[PDB]
Structure formats: structure tokens, C-alpha cells
Amino acid sequence: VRRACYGVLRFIMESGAKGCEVVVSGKLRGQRAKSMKFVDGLMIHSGDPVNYYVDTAVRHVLLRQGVLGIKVKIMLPWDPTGKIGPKKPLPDHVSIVEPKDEILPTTPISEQK
Amino acid sequence: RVQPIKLARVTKVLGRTGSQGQCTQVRVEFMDDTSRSIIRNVKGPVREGDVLTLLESEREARRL
Amino acid sequence: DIKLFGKWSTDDVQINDISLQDYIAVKEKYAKYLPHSAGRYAAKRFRKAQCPIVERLTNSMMMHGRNNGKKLMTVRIVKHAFEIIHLLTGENPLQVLVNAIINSGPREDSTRIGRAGTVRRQAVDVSPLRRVNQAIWLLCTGAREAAFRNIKTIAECLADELINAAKGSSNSYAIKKKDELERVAKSNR
Amino acid sequence: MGRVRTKTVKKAARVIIEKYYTRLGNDFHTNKRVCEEIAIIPSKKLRNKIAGYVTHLMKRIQRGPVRGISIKLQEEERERRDNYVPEVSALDQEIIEVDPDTKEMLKLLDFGSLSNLQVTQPTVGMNFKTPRGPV
RNA sequence: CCGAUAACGAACGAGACUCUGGCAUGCUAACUAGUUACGCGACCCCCGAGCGGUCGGCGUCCCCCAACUUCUUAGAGGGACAAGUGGCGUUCAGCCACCCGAGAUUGAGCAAUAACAGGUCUGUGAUGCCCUUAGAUGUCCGGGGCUGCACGCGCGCUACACUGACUGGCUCAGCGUGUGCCUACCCUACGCCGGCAGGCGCGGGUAACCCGUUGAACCCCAUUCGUGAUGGGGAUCGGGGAUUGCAAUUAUUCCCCAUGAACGAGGAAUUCCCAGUAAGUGCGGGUCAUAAGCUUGCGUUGAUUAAGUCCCUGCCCUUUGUACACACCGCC
Ligand SMILES: [Mg+2]
Ligand SMILES: [Mg+2]
Ligand SMILES: [Mg+2]
């Protein structure tokens, strides 16, 4: 499970995303079942943006010892602005656009046009 | 024999007491010996700068 | 100018102690034509300190848990009792009401955290807002208990306890509890 | 009163202020608007508490620098410091009080003569010699 | 986060946002919302007034025989988001008060790291293992039960009355619901019969067009009662009439006339709460063939008190200790 989840984490990251979360639940070898969570990158948790930035999926794996619970949570980088990455970036990204020099310290100068 | 009822302006309040807010230190003056003031614990809202009735002046004085 | 209920001009009432002059709420500056307004008074402090005293009556007599929205009960009862009083003593029911308020407002109580003697440990003076609050409460609850199992309606109960407290008669439940609180506090001095 | 806080909820405004060093003031309703729409901050109530002493910062900067740090504070306030280079020398008086010990060990650099090096008298009695005991 | 500062540079929760509540006589538009003006018709005093006023009566999109969106709606916007002042503070990160303003804190949704042998295998054609599988632990049918009652506990509802009950007259909401896959089952106006329960014709509505202008309750104003367990209260208890249901008994429910018990404001303890708040008071939805003392919401009336504290209970950080680590319901 560790090698497989690391491989999928590699592939998702190379797909390009702000982060991820994967959780595997159920009973592995042995009878005491406990989950174990692999994370990387960024993972927003609260408020509306999760509804349209992170997508999640739950699949149940029919294993001879029972069932395996799988949770995956990827978010979509905003930059496409309507493409596979959604528009309306996260509000903590009001980026300061930078002026030009706008100095012009010379004498009053007239050019007619 | 009994000390007369006296009036008492309230100046700056030191703060609540009784570990529940049940009393508050008020620093009252008797508008006649205006250079003499006494620390005093009262209950209910204080409305800093108001005035309060008082029967016995030399009742209590404890500093937190 | 304001003719409270068509009568009882505000510019007649005199309040005695200047620890209460600003804290009774009868005067012309805020002389309402009637004790009723949804004025957001209790939202922050000290507005109810300015809320007209008759409004405080009509909002305090409205307290039993059986009646909880009947403010109009209250204003009708207080207007009837006001008429009753002005009949009883000819002078302003506002005047008699403020007289009862001052004469039934205690000054000394006991409050501490240690092992209480009889109510508490240390006798303590009261600021003249909890004082008048407790006074009007005591008047109201006296009226309520008096009219509970009697043929008298609350109008006359309020009227008679108001007179009893204003004159001071050691018979109204209000002052009869006031002096006991005062003396037990003096005992816990 | 109500004057008890956590340092952490005190940790409120400088997540904002210098990051947007351009749009603050000394202020009660119009840096208000700028603070409405600028982060992921999920719930309503605490907008006033972040932003209260906020414009008090650019109050400060209009009388003194502070962290911050706003990258506009330091270079302006130090460029002002840059100036005032004195015309006359802060040390050019050409007499300097020196004690006999001083003169004599200038004699081991073998010059105590070709200048002024005016001598002040030694203490003699020397009310120095920092104190010790009672009697 | 200031501020320090062997830290610097980041990330999650947290405080934005989403909806809702609070304003724009500013914008766009309203025959399924209207509002005005008009023209009618009925009206009233009329002795004449008269532009006196009444209409939720009619029409002004069958195409001008009039316009407008204000009232309602819902989108765009804006708008409230520390702009002004003073005061406090190193005057550093916020508050106190005031001005103005619809508003100087609108309530909710979401929600970190971890963790609990918490609950759920009665949610599933989610499922492992075990058990059963034809005289079935499958499945269907008939009946009973889940309702059973010396007792103890929980959540509630009604009351203990005259701030009241009874009777009669007056005047007001807001969410939301409504005709069928299977599935038959909707909301109901109007008219007629029946006191009621109801029934029978008769439409409208698949909905801002009909129920519905939701003529709600509380409350309002006149009557009676008189402090009597009384006309409070309505448990218990008989008979009759309806309705749903294939079937109503251990009473589905409702109605009538009967009976009138405790209860005269409750300990020891204990819960919730601070502004449209608690509470009084009704109305919707789900449950539903008949079903609400339940619950979820919607309103209506409408408070007292407080802007503090660790006193009890409990929680977060910092120092201390320890023999604990299943972690003090420990250890011994
Ligand atoms: Mg939130
Ligand atoms: Mg009776
Ligand atoms: Mg230690």
C-alpha cells in the first residue's frame, strides 16, 4: 500500500496540483484495522472554496480480508481561469500589480500633436 | 450618635472584586472634605463619575 | 406640554436625593406620552438607566412566566392604577411613584465568597441602579403576590403598595423587605 | 475593562498591513473597504478586531518607523539620516586635556612636543576608586 | 502580530467566503405583483355644496381607452467594510465614548493535527468470517405483540386561576404546501343538506394566476363569574353520532351529551438563556389512508437581568513534581 500510494502521489504531483490527500482505511494484514494518511502540498479544509477547488472520491475495495476505504482529495490550481483549473482564485491572492517608473523629473515640456 | 447619611461622588474605579464581579472599588468623596477620599466596594453598575449614597464612611479599605 | 395620559404634567415632580436625580426617568427631557417604545434600550448598558421609569414599571410587571407578551395588560393596569392614585391623593401619580421608588430603594447588602453568615459575609453598599432596579422589582412582585389569591386586581394592589412605600408604613412588602435587607446587612457589617 | 487578550489574537493585523503597505491610513471607514476582500479567513465576526489598531500602524509610520517591516519605511527614514554631514569638524579644537600619565606614554611613541596637547592637572587625591563596605 | 528573537522562510485549522437579516423613492423591468390618476357603477350629508369623501366593485394590453415601480418581486450593482474626533497605551498591535449612518458584533454553513475498541453489519445488490438454507433464521398468508403494570427514571404537554376563565363583538403575520413511474394517495374555492362530526353537487389550481388579500392565535373591546377545588382544571369514566381503513376490539381519529380526580405554585437537586433574546402565543413541513403532547421551521407579542469572575464544573498556554503511561475511574 505504501509503494502504491507513493506512486500515485508521484503521478498526481507530476500532473500538476497545489497538493493532495490520500487516506487508506480498512484492515491490512492482521486483524486490527487502522488508517494511515499520506499528504503533500496544500490542502484547504474550511469554507466554500473546498466545494469547487478540491475534488474528492471514495472507493471501497473488495479485499479477501474485508473492505478497504480509500479517500483521495486533489485541488485544482486556479491559473487556467476557466480551464481544468477553475477561475475565481483563492481570496488570499490579491496580487499587487507593479507600476512603471513614472518619474519624469524634467522641466515642463510641450509637444504638440 | 450614628454617623449621618452622606453622599459620595465616585471617581476612577480600581476594578471588580469578590472574584465574581459582585463588588467594585470606587474611590468615593464626600464633596465637603474634597481632599479626603476613601476606597470602597459597591455592587451593581458603577457609572464612573456618578454619585452614591453612604451611611457609614469608615467601613472598609482593602487594596488588591 | 407633554400631558401624560392627558394629564399629570411632567414639570411638577420633584426628586429628593441627587444620588437619584439623574437616575429616575420621569422628567421632561424624555417625557413620553405613554410608557411604550421598542427602543433597543437593553442592547447596551445604561440606556435602561434612562428608559422612562413608567416604562420600566410596565416592562417589569410583565413578569410571571404565564404572561410574557401582554405589555398592553401592563400599560392598561398602570394607567388604571395611576388614575386610582390621582384619585387617592390628588397629587401626581408620577410624584407618588418616584417617592415610593426612593423610599423603597435599599442601600446596604451583604456579598462575599467566604462562609456566609446569614446571607453573605461582608456588608456592602449598592450602586443606585441595582438599587432602583431592586426597588421597582420589589414593588411589582408585591403587587403580584397581593393580587394572586385576592379579589383585588393588580391595579389596586400596585396603587396601595405604591402609597404605602411612598409614605413609608412598614406594611407594604416592598419596604418590609427593604428594611430587613438593610438590618441584616448592618448585622453583617 | 475587557482588556485581556491573547498575544495570538493580538497576532492579527500584520498578516495584512505591510503586505499591502500601499493602502493604509489613520483611519475609521475607507481602509475599511480595502480590508473586506483580501484573504481566506472563514467566518464573519472578527473583522473589526484584526483591523482596529491597523491604521494605528501607519499613524506610527507618520511619526516613526516600526515592524512591519514596510520596505518603504527604512530606506526613506535612513535617507533622511544620510544628510547633515558637518561642515566644521566635530573634533578640531586643537587643545585636549590630558593627564601626566597620558603625556608620558605619548613620550613612548616619542612625540609629546610637536603639537599642542595641552595638559590638564591630574586628580591628585583621586576621589575615584569606587566604594566598598560600611565602616 | 507587534515586540523581542538562533532563527529564517512557509502550510493547515483560525479569523475571507456562501446564504440569510439590516438600506438605497439610485439601475434594470413587471395583465401571474402592484401603486397611482382616470373613466365608469353603486354609495352615503345633499338643503348643494362635491376636488366631500366609500369600494379588495368594473375597465384603462383584445391594444391605447393613462402613466409610474414607490409599495411586492430579484438581479446587477453599490452599501457597512476601523473615513472623523477625543481618551487611553512605549503611544506599538485594540478597545471606550461620541458624530454620521440601514447598520459600528445579523445568525448560520464549512472546519485542522490526531484520536475514541463511541454508535451503526436494522441503509443498502458495502462487505470479511461464522451460522441457516426446504419441516427454512428465505418468503408469503392468518392471528397476537411490540400498547402489556405493585414500582423507579428521562423529555415533554396541560393546569393549579380574577395579569383569570366564559360569552359575544373588533383587528393583524410569516415560512411553506399542494393531483401521482411503481403510487390508488393533492391543495381546495363555491353552492346544497346535516347542530357537529360530516355528506352531496360544483368548479379552480401541476401554482406570485386557485385554495389565499392565506380575514391565525395570542392580543383587542362589552358581558358573566367572585377567591368557592368555583364557571379554574380536565384526568378517569357511559351512551350516541360521524370519518379513514379490507379489517378500528386492547378503544385509528373526530364530534355531541353526559362524570368531574389530583392539582391551592411544588425539596434534595438540576437545565437553558442574554435582544426581537428567554418566555406567552399560534401557523407550516416531515411522520400521514386517519393521525401530533414530537421534531424541524415560520411568524405574532415580547421581556427582567449583565457587559464580570474563576466562587463551583470544565477547557487552553506557561513553570513545577511524579513511582502514572491501559496515562489518577492510575499507581500502590
Ligand atoms: Mg467559517
Ligand atoms: Mg367549574
Ligand atoms: Mg517539580
PDB file of C-alpha atoms (C1' of nucleotides) and ligand atoms in Angstrom, chain E residues 161 229-234 260, ligand 2:
ATOM      1  C1'   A E 161     -56.800  30.570  38.284  1.00  0.00           C
ATOM      2  C1'   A E 229     -61.064  22.797  44.015  1.00  0.00           C
ATOM      3  C1'   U E 230     -65.664  27.630  41.801  1.00  0.00           C
ATOM      4  C1'   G E 231     -67.810  28.549  35.516  1.00  0.00           C
ATOM      5  C1'   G E 232     -60.151  27.010  37.197  1.00  0.00           C
ATOM      6  C1'   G E 233     -58.547  22.227  35.842  1.00  0.00           C
ATOM      7  C1'   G E 234     -59.908  18.057  32.810  1.00  0.00           C
ATOM      8  C1'   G E 260     -65.645  15.937  37.370  1.00  0.00           C
TER       9        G E 260
HETATM   10 MG    MG F   2     -66.458  24.590  37.404  1.00  0.00          MG
END
